[PDB]
Design a protein around this ligand. Structure first.
Ligand SMILES: O=c1ccn([C@@H]2O[C@H](CO)[C@@H](O)[C@H]2O)c(=O)[nH]1
Length: 120
């Protein structure tokens, strides 16, 4: 039984301005990944099934949740329910929980965001 997953073993890639570490643990109830962001996620999406919960390890930023600004700093917990439009700006390290388990097909692209819109 493989309980532990390391960064060394993970899939690491850039998507829409963020750096993701996807450990590749399989569990139907939740997917937990690491997010590093220097300026922002320059894409707005919503997920029809899963809540996205961001724990801010370090840094600061601002989430836009159905266009509402939600400031965030280190140790804050940002919980986004399904069917909520999400993008964000900031310089942050985060732990993201997608529950139930992340499925890319549950995601709906709304728009791209201009890289100049980020004040970070
Ligand atoms: O397993 C996961 C979890 C999250 N994300 C992406 O991480 C971002 C979280 O803001 C979104 O673009 C979401 O699609 C993935 O690509 N895979």
């Amino acid at each position: 039984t493989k309980y532990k997953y390391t960064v060394e073993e993970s899939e690491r890639f850039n998507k829409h301005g963020i750096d993701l570490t996807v450990y590749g643990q399989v569990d139907p109830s939740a997917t937990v990944v690491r997010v590093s962001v220097e300026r922002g996620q320059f894409q707005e999406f919503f997920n029809v099934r899963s809540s996205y919960t961001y724990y801010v390890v370090s840094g600061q930023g601002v989430f836009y949740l159905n266009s509402e600004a939600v400031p965030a700093g280190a140790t804050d917990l940002i919980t986004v329910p399904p069917n909520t439009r999400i993008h964000y700006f900031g310089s942050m390290e985060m732990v993201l929980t997608v529950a139930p388990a992340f499925n890319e097909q549950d995601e709906r692209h709304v728009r791209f965001i201009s890289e100049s819109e980020s004040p970070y």
